[model samples]
Target: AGFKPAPPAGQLGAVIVDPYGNAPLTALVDLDSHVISDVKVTVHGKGEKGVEISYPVGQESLKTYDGVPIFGLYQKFANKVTVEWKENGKVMKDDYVVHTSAIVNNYMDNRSISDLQQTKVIKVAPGFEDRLYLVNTHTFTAQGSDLHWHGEKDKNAGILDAGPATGALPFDIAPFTFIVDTEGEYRWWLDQDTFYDGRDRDINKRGYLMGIRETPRGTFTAVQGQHWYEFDMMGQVLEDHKLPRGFADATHESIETPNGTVLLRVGKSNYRRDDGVHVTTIRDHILEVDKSGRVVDVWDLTKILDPKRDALLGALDAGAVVNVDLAHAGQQAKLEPDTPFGDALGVGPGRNWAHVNSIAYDAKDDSIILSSRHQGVVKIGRDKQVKWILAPSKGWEKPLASKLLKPVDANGKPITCNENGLCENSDFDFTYTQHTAWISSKGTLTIFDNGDGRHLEQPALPTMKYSRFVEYKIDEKKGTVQQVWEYGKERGYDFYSPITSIIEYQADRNTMFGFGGSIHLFDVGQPTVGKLNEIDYKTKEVKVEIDVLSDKPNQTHYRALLVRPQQMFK
Candidate 1:
């Protein structure tokens, strides 16, 4: 149904399905009453439990005297949408069926569920909360072969048919961002198939969607190549900003700081080296910009960190970290015995040294904590000073050597450590190939240690290694760090997520939510499985554990977090 004007009190006005013509499952209901408060929308599912969201009656809602949003409806079905609101301090509600179309012919058109399913739900504590999982998952399709691993591609399938895949390799691959329910049912998806299908090679040179996160302003935002988008949960693009000319490839993360500015991981374009050679760099630079696309700050890693340091690179599986060194740049790898690891899968033409996957802003001290896969997690101050580094003291020079936070005893005494930050105490260890490092309200520095090259050396075998979601209490004044609490080491290879993963500290019934995002089921070759675990902080009891399964092989997700869909809206 379309628009109808001037409705009576306590009654809804015109029902417009997808008023923005972008979100197919979302509809607009004209709430032409000032007394209508506490508006909530529920979309009933097909015999299964549905989704309900309480739209925030914030400053923006105060101006929407003519519009109310209805979302989470199912496609190709007459979904029942229940609307509840308070009129003059009294609770009132009504239900209507929204007949949705079978196909959505727009940018947000791709919707595939055969790849995602709930494998296990260990236990649901009575006190546990039920929330939607915002999974940053994607299907990475290479030109001729899969970009995930060094495998023999089958002539028929054209993907890895033999050999184990690499979880550490980062590439320019397609991404699909979606919101799923507790039962692994996909509620909403921002699948930009339109851009992926007909994207121009010259214009959209970097061919993948980048980091997407809910902004501090409560709107969903993401970037693609040179483009930046601030959209709503309804898939409506609210604000569109570009990278403003100088910036090239926007990758892995986009952090919207508390002050409303944004930090984006950018790739180096034609960077001239000291040897007078122009080269490309991946995940080695950061760009901060305002909402108007004006540049605020630029953090060039080449000037700050040591670019030639490759201890983490040496410890990796041949192809794990793509060797985009000057000699190998622009050269393709053949299927020969001594071929480079990522040659078959197409590692983009850029050296992936100092891979900065996650960036967290510490509003308390006004510092930016950056998580670099090759280097270690470091918190830099406004003056571009390396305040401290959460890494081993190997191959560090000058400011970096001085910035290494030494391992200390529980009693706040410094424990004598070797150059690698290894100690005889065996209690404290530095982070390795880590992700998602940030300061928690618990007054601790938390990280998801991927545990690859733990002490700058790989385990005897891959299976022998394991990952950990750890926390540490650091005394910046004393230049020391103490292990506070940790999990997943005893879990061993079962939790050995060598690559993309996340850990979010939440203040609720559940203490933390962990995502073993890019894990390879080694025993079962070819395919990769993603694991989700939410545990009780005090007891470490697993309140919720889920195996996010995919029908296709090697489905890797970068991040997963509990999302309150209601809070995302006004």
Candidate 2:
């Protein structure tokens, strides 16, 4: 064991010298009252690479298990690296020297977790398979480098601090690899550029239609330029899906039907006239294709949303651009015309009123549930008929009112709603800018409520803002939505994310996975750490809460998929 220095205290930056003779550097800032959007890292007198690298301080960059804000560097160190950030009318600088101990090349090669580690199975409770599957951008190595892997595991190997927390026993620390029970192998993508955050920042929208098997083996193909990969457990390429030109597959959700078909969300760029200003728009579509990657069917959201355009567009106030990133990281809010949405007002389509994020297909009802971050979760039939929209306010009322379902007390009675239709200082809750709405096998609609708390207004109580995993019992025929269960009602400010997130349910074990990320640090009071948790649905008690720490508050997770062993398929 070498002399490994602990991360510096009370500072926003640190140079972590890992035990493996590698240096992983990180930088963070209190962005609650700042206008900075990016931070640049420049290395002087370094080894094998460019002199300067820049990364945006957004949700995508914060999707790390260790909570290292921005991004971490793994290259061999030389002399020193200087960090520069400009925001809120000031430019700040910081630097860290590369000790002689810092290695001279990328810390580690792209490889799967060794059999020695994989053989150690994780122990699962009865009625639940020991194997589990989780999706994250990457995991931090003891050496400070990131090891990327995606697959399923059944039991707990009980390895501490081996990786990220897995939401099982010991409760305190759960690593990516542990030892205990169950058995399975997992593999990660090899192309380092394919990982989100620093890679090709301009094109960050990528998708993976992945499947894990009991005896995972085989190679997969890769699509050029796009991050869409078709690989296997042994790190081989069999075949990759080539999406249509001008389209980017969303990593939010991907599914393979029993009949050898794939369904995923594919987004494209478009220009809209918001009031009178021309704005960039990123529209999404639910695409169905065969195993060969030929399009079988498509659900064009633009056409479906044409009728309720006002309601959806109105909710995305042009004034909202001040708190949002309009140009970078897949945001099309600031395209041509170069004016904010507020300036245009009912004059054009420049605003991305219908910023659709996630989609799910319900085979039982033969319908699709689309989660519009700007609007609310809605169900649409194959014929494109609007099957009653689930929001907080009544459909005919305020554009983005809370019509979905009001929070209920433990006794199952509806909580009171303020005149504004917002769940005021009470136990009742509603989600604004929510994500991941899917129908479960038991006919319940589950949502990762990224509670923006629109009605609270600025400078309001911190308790008014938070996020949760809420489930609803929908009576489609009766045209009503009722909140049957919700988690995180009391811990409002502790668990809120304005952007990307996920909520997954494991019925057999009666457990749910809730993940959330803060896209930006603009909020007056937001938690510095992103969160992912495993909760006992019936008890509404958290079994495990994994704190994703970051130097800054802004972060986004493209996906937090929980892949179980038996859930994998061809």
Candidate 3:
């Protein structure tokens, strides 16, 4: 048996096994000389199609392949992998076989080995033929809900038995981060330490790692407790630092400022009113930190906007904000523990006003856009100036009322608007309990109008309501907004998402939407599903669609992003 499958002798050095230990399926291989172009890796999926990912040029400083990651191997199987590069103006290739153990499910539930956690592709059009879906999700436990969880910590082992929390429903953070192909094949995941699990950990500690997004530098940012991390896909920690002093905790979303500064949603530890009243606040303050984790500036929303506004007091159904299920879609939850836990997800005793969920930075005007569930989308300017409010103008107060952006018809004529901000033109309506307020390259603003509160009031038949991904063109001088584009309303309740969602612009002139909070009540049993769609920006044709669900109840996700797994490298 001379064919012992010996490792490569030269150029490709001895393969290191799980060098980082966090990405168990990855190995490190070395090259004698630096490659010229990008490094390409291919993981052969035994007899079927496979995955090929690469690090783009100028993404990093590593010239030599001292430790080019060999990843994407199939779990517990011997995977044939090919590594290719250009050296001395010539193409060089190395073929190696990687064998990996089964991915350990540290998540308390038996998510693995069942239909519990899986993604299904429902449609695929031209624009989304080959893509990956990156998601933000988490496992809710006793600390996340009030129901008593009496069980062994053994089914999945290493389970944190948080016992019982009072009157709480699952308001969660930190996604069990992962990536999958359009074909629904699980590709990559973050096998993190137990400490990162939100359950059984201090609410103010590095509990749940969430809002996972790729940075311009090609690394990822995630938040938990008060710390935000910048790390590579090879499971390498680049920046592990705490959010600067003063902020109690950060979660939901984090983006880079123009100069690579970190922008995060924070809960203030010491908030007070101008009248010297100590007020508690959560999910409302914005924090800007240097890449080195120094506080750049803070936007205390309480001081900028009227934090006591109860217009859309409708919770995204008492989810991650707090569990007041009695007001959820006008139907009581069938969940156990009749007595509810007070403030399960809130940092302290205070109203969940201005539940700001998403953040978008404006480079042109140096303005910041926020998506508040209680209120609508708002643009905050320098010194916390109210740039504009994107919600209905029902009972808006003085100065804030002046900041309201009036809806305009396509003809540039003012649409006769009602006090509730609904236009008589039948084509324009303000965003209601919206999320993911972002600016398009065309200077238009877009949002996932989570249409939970129309005209500042929840509909009598919430089930018949609908949500849409809407885009608007704003004329700040005249303080007018035109409804340029809208989608998802035609799909009705089936496509409705009352809470967390996103509508992002793509370079291909297509639009992508994430239905992160689509729920259905089969007699009050929580059977929620998250959706990801890529559509033709012009024709409204669905390019790609996916449904993320599970057999268990309350199977929800916070966000789904169209990602290129290769871009995650370098």
Candidate 4:
């Protein structure tokens, strides 16, 4: 074949991808318009390596982009980077530094996700107390660009008091949510603010754990690493209790127990089975730790589901097999000396099969409600048995009769099921891939239904997709569940966030707060902003609604808590 002619040269667009938490840094380059071929990035640091990533654009077009490959950067140590491409019979080059240190500490002086507490409170003028303390990943001006236009010039439109031009702080704020205490001081916590868009942010930074004390306008270490601390009123560190070695906080919320214990959801990563396949499955354990940090009572989901893994996979069908190479035909078990359940495999480390994001304890039934992003809301009894599973009744291809509970009457009596143990239609309908499921003290079930809109043999239709804060009246004894109320049912697409969102109940006012944490107006695109709503349950009206917009990709607030300032230290 004759030699192909070289293409003309064009400009290349590049931007640094800096995320919060213990995450790595990478670069994103626009290759669609660049007249270059065989592009590569050479990160010059302690060692030199070529980084490149290839992907399929359409049916036949295979494209390569630089920075898709992960790189080892000195996050406190600076490194140089060079981008090179072949264009028009010449080699084009551009230089940039992997400024991880300065970048990681970009918002050091300001309210950052790394800092556990806010340095100071925002000025609250008249009528502030009547409103709830709003927390979100607030907006900031993008570098080398003007303020992001939401079709309006006014900042914080639809949002009260807080706006972009407030300019009340110096550097940009990470973990952008802040709470106003009874003393009118701002507060925050140092929990993991993972950027769902995928970026490496640090999780292990010393002195980054503390709490805002309003009475004296000082602070104290609430938690550090695996340790929980108690501080004196004067900000003196008092008791330092370390969690058991085997357990650590998985999700953000850790419930405090009355028996001098803390209930924590701990994640276990990279579990290896004895089978030939190198399966990667991440699971969570509900650990109850005493004051001495010793793990007292614990419930492990892995062991609970391991026996039924095969049926679970079969229920999901072949589409759920993300690591197809490792899976055997006819739904064979991946673990050696196979148990009843098959092995759960993933492409790489930490690729979870059932990502249990949150946990809520129900003392009345001595059970806990687990929010599984992949599966559904699972209720596990205190004896480690599954009481019920609230999931899609018919969406999955090969439904597991055992995993899906049959609907019952209000008195906890089961509805009639045919020999197949399935009702002609489910007693209740629920959205797919939900979050934040809890049994309130009032014995009601609240869930932030993500409405993932992904099921067997179907494309994700955005039109029919939307999220809602659904509260159900579940009579577990009768095996009956009903959607007692729902918020954002009519708000459609605008209120959707396929992943990472939550609903908090304000007990005092009998109202509720909802956070559409990661709304994707268009699929696979970076989430630009989030929606926060305050709903009056009595009237079923959205009392206040606001948008938490930000310029950075990783700045979306995934979870929120309702804190009544007066309730603190009470």
For residue 30, model 1's alpha carbon misses the true position, in angstroms, by 2.8
What digit string (tens of lDDT, one per residue) describes model 1 on residues 1-570? Answer: 998563442367666677666556667777655457677776776674444444444436434425667766666778777778787888887777778774332222223334443455555555453566777765644341223422323234436446433222234555556666555556665544523443334434334565667787667667666667677766667766767665565666777888889888776555655644344456777887888989898888777777656556555543243122223321222222322222232222235557788887888787788998878988888777789988777777885788888887778788787776567856677888898887777778889998877777766666788889898888889888898888998998777876788888788664888889766634333445678788778899887776776444544567776777567667
Put down candidate 3 lDDT per residue, 204-270, tens digits, no spaces.
Answer: 4344456666688667777776678877666776777776666655666888766888789876654
* Cα lDDT for residue 82, candidate 2: 61
Q: Compare the candidates by TM-score and give the number of the best one.
A: 3
| TM-score-better candidate, 1 vs 4 | 1
RMSD of candidate 3 to the truth, in angstroms, is 7.2
- Alpha-carbon lDDT of model 1: 0.65
**Model 2 Cα shift for residue 393 (angstroms):** 3.6
TM-score of each: 0.82, 0.55, 0.84, 0.55
Per-prediction RMSD in angstroms?
7.6, 20.7, 7.2, 23.7
Tens digits of per-residue lDDT, candidate 4, 418-516, equal 432234444434645577787665668888987653332123333565678888776566566665677776777777665567786767567777767
On lDDT, the candidate that comes out on top is 1
- What lDDT score is found at residue 507 in candidate 3? 62
lDDT of 2 by residue, 247-313 (tens): 4434345555544555666454332323332222233466777766777787766556542434333
